[PDB]
Amino acid sequence: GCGALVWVGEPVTLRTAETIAGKYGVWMRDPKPTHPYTQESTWRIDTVGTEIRQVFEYSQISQFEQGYPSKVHVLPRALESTGAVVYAGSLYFQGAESRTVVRYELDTETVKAEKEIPGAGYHGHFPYAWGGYTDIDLAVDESGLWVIYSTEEAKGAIVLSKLNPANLELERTWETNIRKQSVANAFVICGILYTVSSYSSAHATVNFAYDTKTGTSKTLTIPFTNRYKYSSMIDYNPLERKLFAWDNFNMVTYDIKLL
Ligand SMILES: [Ca+2]
Ligand SMILES: [K+]
Ligand code: NA
């Protein structure tokens, strides 16, 4: 059952990248797995380099922990930053030097939809506090697919849109009063957008919650540990009820509890 976030566990490290190209990246499982994948299927994308086009796939968690992909997908265009998600058999990612979200069906290796996110800043315009090109952050929660961004119209405040997963049409949009560049990262749980205060502190907090049901925000002080002091990616998986994160070469999870 859904509820507000009340607790975040301490990070558990599943894999440590062995090259500097893995200092930051995105890794994830599918909260709505579809044949031929399972809830154990894992994807991993190192994103420090240029021309990021290869997506590593692991059919078993033990393969992921040992660093041995079972498949490698080649994307037809390059991918930007750490914000991508997998949902219902597709990778949703941002095209390099663009504000375009691309739907890449993993089993057929085909692009099924593209969508320019209207007004979205990109390429270091509205990054998170972590910097880089973290302007556009996709998210999956219990009700489906979302994208987190900002616009000049919103003057840098986080904008949140719900997306049709088949054709990437924007179904609804909310404008917060939370400055995107002031928070380390963000994610959605049960229709509530949460932000993290710091990418480096061992005593950070989940520090804001914006509820889409009310269109209002509140402060929070839920403790959050950046164990390795450089978190580039923090997302939520509603099937596992865990945060998945990338922190200074380490692919980690945080258990969460809801009220
Ligand atoms: Ca995120
Ligand atoms: K980046
Ligand atoms: Na994301």
Coordinates of all heavy atoms in Angstrom, one line a residue, residues 141-190:
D141 N 7.1 5.5 -10.5 CA 6.5 5.1 -9.2 C 5.4 4.2 -9.4 O 5.2 3.6 -10.4 CB 6.1 6.4 -8.4 CG 4.7 6.9 -8.8 OD1 4.2 6.7 -9.9 OD2 4.1 7.6 -7.9
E142 N 4.6 4.0 -8.3 CA 3.5 3.1 -8.3 C 2.4 3.3 -9.4 O 1.7 2.4 -9.8 CB 2.8 3.1 -6.9 CG 3.6 2.5 -5.8 CD 4.8 3.3 -5.2 OE1 5.0 4.5 -5.7 OE2 5.5 2.9 -4.3
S143 N 2.4 4.5 -9.9 CA 1.4 4.9 -10.9 C 2.0 5.0 -12.3 O 1.2 5.3 -13.3 CB 0.6 6.2 -10.5 OG 1.4 7.3 -10.8
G144 N 3.3 4.9 -12.5 CA 3.8 4.9 -13.8 C 5.0 5.8 -14.0 O 5.9 6.0 -13.1
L145 N 5.1 6.5 -15.1 CA 6.3 7.2 -15.6 C 6.2 8.7 -15.5 O 5.1 9.2 -15.8 CB 6.6 6.8 -17.1 CG 7.9 7.3 -17.7 CD1 9.1 6.7 -17.1 CD2 7.8 7.1 -19.2
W146 N 7.3 9.3 -15.0 CA 7.4 10.8 -14.8 C 8.7 11.3 -15.3 O 9.6 10.5 -15.6 CB 7.3 11.1 -13.3 CG 6.3 10.4 -12.5 CD1 6.2 9.1 -12.1 CD2 5.1 11.1 -11.9 NE1 5.1 8.9 -11.3 CE2 4.4 10.1 -11.2 CE3 4.6 12.4 -11.9 CZ2 3.3 10.4 -10.4 CZ3 3.5 12.7 -11.2 CH2 2.8 11.6 -10.5
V147 N 8.7 12.6 -15.5 CA 10.0 13.3 -15.8 C 10.1 14.5 -15.0 O 9.1 15.3 -14.8 CB 10.2 13.6 -17.3 CG1 9.1 14.5 -17.8 CG2 11.6 14.1 -17.6
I148 N 11.3 14.8 -14.4 CA 11.7 15.9 -13.5 C 12.6 16.8 -14.3 O 13.6 16.3 -14.8 CB 12.3 15.4 -12.2 CG1 11.4 14.4 -11.5 CG2 12.8 16.5 -11.4 CD1 12.1 13.5 -10.5
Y149 N 12.4 18.1 -14.3 CA 13.1 19.0 -15.1 C 12.9 20.4 -14.6 O 12.2 20.6 -13.6 CB 12.8 18.9 -16.6 CG 11.3 19.1 -17.0 CD1 10.9 20.2 -17.6 CD2 10.4 18.1 -16.7 CE1 9.5 20.4 -18.0 CE2 9.0 18.2 -17.0 CZ 8.6 19.4 -17.7 OH 7.3 19.5 -18.0
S150 N 13.4 21.4 -15.3 CA 12.9 22.8 -15.1 C 12.8 23.5 -16.4 O 13.2 23.0 -17.5 CB 13.8 23.5 -14.1 OG 13.1 24.7 -13.7
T151 N 12.3 24.7 -16.4 CA 12.1 25.6 -17.5 C 12.4 27.0 -17.1 O 12.4 27.4 -16.0 CB 10.6 25.5 -18.1 OG1 9.8 26.1 -17.1 CG2 10.2 24.1 -18.3
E152 N 12.7 27.9 -18.2 CA 12.8 29.3 -17.9 C 11.5 29.9 -17.3 O 11.6 30.8 -16.5 CB 13.3 30.0 -19.1 CG 14.8 29.7 -19.4 CD 15.3 30.4 -20.7 OE1 14.5 31.3 -21.2 OE2 16.4 30.1 -21.2
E153 N 10.4 29.4 -17.8 CA 9.1 29.9 -17.3 C 9.0 29.6 -15.8 O 8.4 30.5 -15.1 CB 8.0 29.2 -18.1 CG 8.1 29.3 -19.6 CD 8.8 28.1 -20.2 OE1 8.2 27.0 -20.4 OE2 10.1 28.2 -20.5
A154 N 9.5 28.5 -15.4 CA 9.5 28.1 -13.9 C 10.6 28.7 -13.2 O 10.7 28.5 -12.0 CB 9.4 26.6 -13.8
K155 N 11.6 29.4 -13.9 CA 12.7 30.1 -13.2 C 13.5 29.2 -12.3 O 13.9 29.5 -11.2 CB 12.1 31.3 -12.4 CG 11.4 32.3 -13.2 CD 11.6 33.7 -12.7 CE 11.3 33.8 -11.2 NZ 11.1 35.2 -10.7
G156 N 13.8 28.0 -12.9 CA 14.6 27.0 -12.2 C 13.9 26.1 -11.2 O 14.6 25.2 -10.6
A157 N 12.6 26.4 -10.9 CA 11.9 25.5 -9.9 C 11.7 24.1 -10.6 O 11.5 24.1 -11.8 CB 10.6 26.1 -9.5
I158 N 11.7 23.1 -9.8 CA 11.4 21.7 -10.3 C 10.0 21.7 -11.0 O 9.0 22.2 -10.4 CB 11.5 20.7 -9.2 CG1 13.0 20.5 -8.8 CG2 11.0 19.4 -9.7 CD1 13.1 19.5 -7.6
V159 N 10.0 21.2 -12.2 CA 8.7 20.9 -12.9 C 8.6 19.4 -13.0 O 9.6 18.7 -13.3 CB 8.7 21.6 -14.3 CG1 7.4 21.3 -15.0 CG2 8.8 23.1 -14.2
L160 N 7.4 18.9 -12.8 CA 7.2 17.5 -12.8 C 6.0 17.1 -13.8 O 5.0 17.8 -13.7 CB 6.8 17.0 -11.4 CG 6.4 15.6 -11.2 CD1 7.6 14.6 -11.5 CD2 6.0 15.4 -9.7
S161 N 6.3 16.2 -14.7 CA 5.2 15.8 -15.6 C 5.1 14.3 -15.6 O 6.0 13.5 -15.6 CB 5.6 16.3 -17.1 OG 5.5 17.7 -17.2
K162 N 3.8 13.9 -15.7 CA 3.4 12.5 -15.9 C 3.4 12.1 -17.4 O 2.9 12.9 -18.1 CB 2.1 12.2 -15.2 CG 1.7 10.7 -15.1 CD 2.5 10.1 -13.9 CE 2.3 8.6 -13.9 NZ 0.9 8.2 -13.7
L163 N 4.0 11.0 -17.7 CA 4.2 10.6 -19.1 C 3.4 9.4 -19.5 O 3.4 8.4 -18.7 CB 5.7 10.4 -19.5 CG 6.6 11.6 -19.3 CD1 8.0 11.1 -19.5 CD2 6.2 12.7 -20.3
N164 N 2.8 9.4 -20.7 CA 2.3 8.2 -21.3 C 3.4 7.3 -21.6 O 4.3 7.7 -22.4 CB 1.4 8.6 -22.5 CG 0.8 7.3 -23.2 OD1 1.4 6.3 -23.5 ND2 -0.5 7.5 -23.5
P165 N 3.5 6.1 -21.1 CA 4.7 5.2 -21.4 C 4.8 4.7 -22.8 O 5.8 4.3 -23.3 CB 4.6 4.1 -20.4 CG 3.1 4.0 -20.1 CD 2.6 5.4 -20.1
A166 N 3.6 4.7 -23.6 CA 3.7 4.2 -24.9 C 4.2 5.2 -25.9 O 5.0 4.9 -26.7 CB 2.3 3.7 -25.3
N167 N 3.7 6.4 -25.8 CA 4.0 7.4 -26.8 C 4.6 8.7 -26.3 O 4.8 9.7 -27.0 CB 2.7 7.8 -27.6 CG 1.6 8.3 -26.8 OD1 1.8 8.9 -25.7 ND2 0.4 8.3 -27.3
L168 N 4.9 8.7 -24.9 CA 5.6 9.8 -24.3 C 4.8 11.1 -24.3 O 5.4 12.2 -24.0 CB 7.0 10.0 -24.9 CG 8.0 8.9 -24.5 CD1 9.3 9.1 -25.2 CD2 8.1 8.9 -23.0
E169 N 3.5 11.1 -24.6 CA 2.8 12.4 -24.4 C 2.7 12.8 -22.9 O 2.7 11.9 -22.0 CB 1.4 12.2 -24.9 CG 1.2 12.3 -26.5 CD 1.7 13.6 -27.0 OE1 0.9 14.6 -27.0 OE2 2.9 13.7 -27.4
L170 N 2.8 14.1 -22.7 CA 2.7 14.6 -21.3 C 1.2 14.6 -20.9 O 0.4 15.3 -21.5 CB 3.2 16.0 -21.2 CG 4.8 16.2 -21.1 CD1 5.5 15.7 -22.3 CD2 5.1 17.6 -20.7
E171 N 0.9 13.9 -19.8 CA -0.5 13.8 -19.4 C -0.9 14.9 -18.4 O -2.0 15.4 -18.4 CB -0.7 12.5 -18.7 CG -0.4 11.3 -19.7 CD -0.7 9.9 -19.1 OE1 -0.7 9.9 -17.8 OE2 -0.8 8.9 -19.8
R172 N 0.1 15.3 -17.5 CA -0.2 16.4 -16.6 C 1.1 16.9 -16.1 O 2.1 16.2 -16.1 CB -1.0 15.8 -15.4 CG -1.4 16.9 -14.3 CD -2.5 16.4 -13.4 NE -2.7 17.4 -12.4 CZ -3.5 17.2 -11.3 NH1 -4.1 16.0 -11.1 NH2 -3.6 18.1 -10.4
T173 N 1.1 18.2 -15.7 CA 2.3 18.9 -15.3 C 2.1 19.7 -14.0 O 1.1 20.3 -13.9 CB 2.9 19.8 -16.4 OG1 3.2 19.0 -17.6 CG2 4.1 20.6 -16.0
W174 N 3.0 19.6 -13.1 CA 3.0 20.4 -11.9 C 4.3 21.3 -11.8 O 5.4 20.8 -12.1 CB 3.1 19.5 -10.6 CG 1.9 18.6 -10.4 CD1 0.8 18.8 -9.5 CD2 1.6 17.4 -11.1 NE1 -0.1 17.8 -9.6 CE2 0.4 16.9 -10.6 CE3 2.2 16.6 -12.1 CZ2 -0.2 15.7 -11.0 CZ3 1.7 15.4 -12.5 CH2 0.4 15.0 -12.0
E175 N 4.1 22.5 -11.3 CA 5.2 23.4 -11.1 C 5.4 23.6 -9.6 O 4.5 24.1 -8.9 CB 5.0 24.8 -11.8 CG 6.1 25.7 -11.6 CD 5.7 27.2 -12.0 OE1 5.2 27.9 -11.1 OE2 5.9 27.5 -13.1
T176 N 6.6 23.1 -9.1 CA 6.9 23.3 -7.7 C 7.5 24.7 -7.5 O 7.7 25.5 -8.4 CB 7.9 22.2 -7.2 OG1 9.2 22.6 -7.7 CG2 7.5 20.9 -7.7
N177 N 7.8 25.0 -6.2 CA 8.6 26.1 -5.8 C 9.9 25.6 -5.1 O 10.4 26.2 -4.2 CB 7.8 27.0 -4.9 CG 8.5 28.4 -4.6 OD1 9.3 28.8 -5.5 ND2 8.2 29.0 -3.5
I178 N 10.5 24.5 -5.6 CA 11.7 24.0 -5.1 C 12.8 24.2 -6.2 O 12.6 23.7 -7.3 CB 11.6 22.5 -4.8 CG1 10.5 22.2 -3.7 CG2 12.9 21.9 -4.3 CD1 10.1 20.8 -3.7
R179 N 13.9 24.8 -5.9 CA 14.9 25.1 -6.9 C 15.7 23.8 -7.2 O 16.3 23.2 -6.3 CB 15.9 26.2 -6.4 CG 16.9 26.6 -7.4 CD 17.6 27.9 -7.0 NE 18.7 28.3 -7.9 CZ 19.9 27.8 -7.9 NH1 20.2 26.9 -6.9 NH2 20.8 28.2 -8.8
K180 N 15.6 23.4 -8.5 CA 16.2 22.2 -8.9 C 17.7 22.2 -8.6 O 18.3 21.2 -8.1 CB 15.9 21.9 -10.3 CG 16.4 20.5 -10.8 CD 15.9 20.0 -12.1 CE 16.4 18.7 -12.5 NZ 17.9 18.6 -12.6
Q181 N 18.4 23.3 -8.9 CA 19.9 23.4 -8.8 C 20.3 23.4 -7.3 O 21.5 23.2 -7.0 CB 20.3 24.6 -9.5 CG 20.4 24.5 -11.0 CD 20.3 25.8 -11.8 OE1 21.3 26.3 -12.3 NE2 19.2 26.5 -11.8
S182 N 19.3 23.5 -6.4 CA 19.7 23.5 -4.9 C 19.6 22.1 -4.3 O 20.1 22.0 -3.2 CB 18.7 24.4 -4.2 OG 18.9 25.8 -4.5
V183 N 19.1 21.1 -5.0 CA 19.0 19.8 -4.4 C 19.9 18.8 -5.1 O 20.2 19.0 -6.3 CB 17.5 19.3 -4.4 CG1 16.6 20.2 -3.7 CG2 17.0 19.0 -5.8
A184 N 20.3 17.7 -4.4 CA 21.3 16.8 -5.0 C 20.7 15.9 -6.1 O 21.4 15.6 -7.0 CB 21.9 16.0 -3.8
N185 N 19.5 15.4 -5.8 CA 18.7 14.6 -6.8 C 17.3 14.6 -6.3 O 17.0 15.2 -5.3 CB 19.3 13.2 -6.9 CG 19.2 12.6 -8.3 OD1 18.1 12.3 -8.7 ND2 20.3 12.5 -9.0
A186 N 16.5 13.8 -6.9 CA 15.0 13.7 -6.6 C 14.5 12.4 -7.1 O 15.1 11.7 -8.0 CB 14.3 14.9 -7.2
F187 N 13.3 12.0 -6.6 CA 12.6 10.8 -7.1 C 11.2 11.0 -6.6 O 10.8 11.8 -5.8 CB 13.3 9.6 -6.5 CG 13.6 9.6 -5.0 CD1 12.6 9.4 -4.1 CD2 14.8 10.0 -4.6 CE1 12.8 9.4 -2.7 CE2 15.1 10.1 -3.2 CZ 14.1 9.8 -2.3
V188 N 10.3 10.1 -7.1 CA 8.9 10.1 -6.8 C 8.5 8.8 -6.1 O 8.8 7.7 -6.6 CB 8.0 10.3 -8.1 CG1 6.5 10.2 -7.8 CG2 8.4 11.6 -8.8
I189 N 7.7 8.9 -5.0 CA 7.1 7.8 -4.4 C 5.6 8.1 -4.1 O 5.3 9.1 -3.5 CB 7.8 7.5 -3.0 CG1 9.3 7.2 -3.2 CG2 7.1 6.2 -2.4 CD1 10.0 7.0 -1.8
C190 N 4.8 7.2 -4.6 CA 3.3 7.4 -4.3 C 2.8 8.8 -4.7 O 2.1 9.4 -3.9 CB 3.0 7.0 -2.9 SG 3.3 5.2 -2.6

